């Protein structure tokens, strides 16, 4: 066997991916297609009656017929499916990544708009605050038997704020807080993950850096999924990497009495990760008032009746899910954790940064591997080794 | 029976609910009668090892050594204890209604939003926040339990309109149109079982009472403020938790429990009428809306890690978890808290909101210049 250790081409990871995820729903949609179609899902009446063991009484449960009464919400409407449609933007994913070049001027650049951001370590130090915030909202803890898991989290924060090249996160060139993505790897093996698990994870972690490079490097991306909701929706789930951050929460989670089977448990898993998805739309409205009043009417106002509509509908397919003790709160996660968030909070407010408190420095430190900061970083979490 | 007692004086009210309630922890403490006592609960470290059925798995899960992390947050700090002389407490209130009078302010506004005139105006705003209460606590809006919507409706009002106690128990005041008596009535036809009604309204009764008091007696704030821990249960009193949490149970348990009973469960209910309270002030502080008020944040974090904790393990979790922290989404999504930090007006009641509320309307008992609240509810 020639021993080939050429870093794979954007392209190749593409491929590699498409090989492992198969196509969704709709031939031809790999790797950029969930196997459940949203624009199906139905709404059963409530009897009212339910045992004490009923999946309802888990995460928020907010009636569809009840949403009128909160201004920041409204009725729900069915979204129109443009589904069908992704093969066409996988077609167009492909043509770009043949022609583009193996690196970028803009590569490593900082993108999270706060023109206060300028040191890369920095933003992911603020990433590993949201990255345990998410976590403990989910439901799990800081013991540190979870350390590996929660830093995993903080790769999938990062790729929204600092344009990581796909090849350079493959090869070890980037480093979250002075880990490689393979130290990642490495350390999840250690927590006791199964190697199947690892690989989807790791595999959702790839289509994560992917996406959210191209919508950074690939101009007309976003304009392609722009008002086709239903694609919209879809991808911006890939993005934020939630059925990937889902998968090790619920392996930290689970009763003692087994693995995570995307073959068995990929329907509600993927519901989940739709979900929490699109609690960020329905709460961040409340956070401009937090500090705002507007009129929201026309075809603003009907993307939020449709994204309503596919919210109620994930919750209560949820209710009967075997993970429903886990999920249901992931699902609703986000109506607690955006009013509560630092994330959140910073951006209304002038788009600064809150400090990092010294109880929170504490917190962060053990996840910072300093052996391996470069030299300007040297001085990050300061207040942190206390 | 000869018709006997057919009026009570608010001085008689008062002994009602002393001899139904009972004492508390302490001796001499009746109405004041909650058994658990928040100074004295210790945070056990967290194992990790939880089953499917765990009850941490219910309602929202924030680790004490987890709150540093958000700024609007920060660590925990036990509280003082001056719970052992709520009977000095009583023995005040005893003392005052021995010459109680009727105030000056009965029927006037007090709900902090200038733009309100209206008192029924004012009463359906509060149908409103009541059913998005009732909705984040994990209920419907199943025609079955009208009346105990209502009944939340009652514990809102007074907040927001000043109800003397004589008033609001002869049908002189009336909420959306409805007399409590109304109310009462209106369970018993809802199955909800005599021994439960009797609890809920005895709960109303001593909000009613505990609310008018704060109001007419000038010395009682003043002699709670300097005993942090007893205000808190006396503001625990005054929500009424415990009277809304006990109905709520009844519409949402499963029909193989029979009625809920207060004598069976008084203790978690307890615990979980605690935790909303807690809740509700640790969020309204956090979220933008006491001596040291940096200080008291962190007491009151305190108290609500080791109520939530306590609650893992009840019988009931499945229900009291989310009752116990629901504030948590419920304060940034409600109008009711909207509408404060947006400069203290009034939302619209959209045509939408509007259908929802207009069954809870009995219009034909309205005041003439209420008789078109609602109008885009028909
Ligand atoms: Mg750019
Ligand atoms: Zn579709
Ligand atoms: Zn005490």
Redesign the pocket.
């Known amino acids: 066997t020639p021993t080939k250790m050429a870093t794979l081409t954007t392209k190749q990871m593409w491929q590699t991916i498409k090989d492992y995820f198969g196509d969704g729903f709709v031939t031809g949609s790999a790797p950029i297609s969930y196997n459940v ?4 899902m139905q709404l059963q009446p409530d009897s009212g009656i339910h045992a004490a063991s009923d999946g309802i009484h888990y995460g928020v449960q907010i009636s569809e017929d009840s949403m009128p009464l909160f201004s920041i919400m409204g009725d729900t409407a069915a ?1 129109p ?4 449609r992704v093969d066409e933007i996988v077609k167009h994913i492909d043509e770009f990544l043949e022609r583009a070049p193996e690196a970028l001027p803009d590569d490593g650049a900082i993108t999270s708009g706060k023109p206060c951001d300028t040191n890369p370590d920095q933003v992911s130090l603020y990433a590993m605050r949201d990255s345990l915030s998410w976590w403990v909202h989910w439901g799990g803890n800081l013991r540190p038997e979870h350390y590996w898991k929660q830093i995993y989290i903080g790769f999938a924060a990062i790729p929204d704020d600092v344009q990581i090249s796909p090849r350079e996160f493959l090869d070890g060139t980037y480093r979250y807080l002075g880990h490689t993505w393979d130290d990642c790897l490495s350390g999840l093996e250690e927590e006791g993950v199964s190697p199947d698990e690892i690989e989807f994870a790791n595999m959702c972690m790839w289509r994560q850096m992917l996406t959210q490079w191209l919508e950074k490097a690939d101009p007309e991306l976003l304009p392609l999924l722009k008002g086709k909701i ?1 694609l919209m929706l879809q991808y911006r789930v890939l993005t934020a990497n939630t059925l990937g951050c889902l998968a090790l929460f619920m392996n930290a989670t689970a009763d003692p009495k087994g693995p995570i089977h995307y073959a068995d448990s990929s329907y509600e898993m993927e519901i989940a990760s739709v979900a929490q998805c699109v609690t960020l739309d329905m709460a961040k409205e409340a956070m401009g008032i937090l500090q705002r009043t507007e009129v929201v009417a026309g075809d603003r106002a009907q993307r939020k009746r449709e994204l309503r509509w596919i919210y109620v509908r994930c919750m209560q397919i949820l209710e009967s899910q075997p993970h429903a003790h886990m999920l249901r709160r992931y699902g609703s996660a986000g109506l607690h954790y955006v009013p509560m968030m630092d994330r959140y909070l910073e951006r209304v407010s002038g788009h600064t940064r809150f400090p990092i408190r010294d109880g929170a420095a504490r917190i962060l430190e053990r996840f910072i591997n300093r052996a391996e900061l470069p030299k300007e970083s040297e001085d990050i979490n300061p207040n942190g080794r206390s």
């Open positions: 179609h949203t624009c199906d979204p499916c443009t589904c069908h239903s």
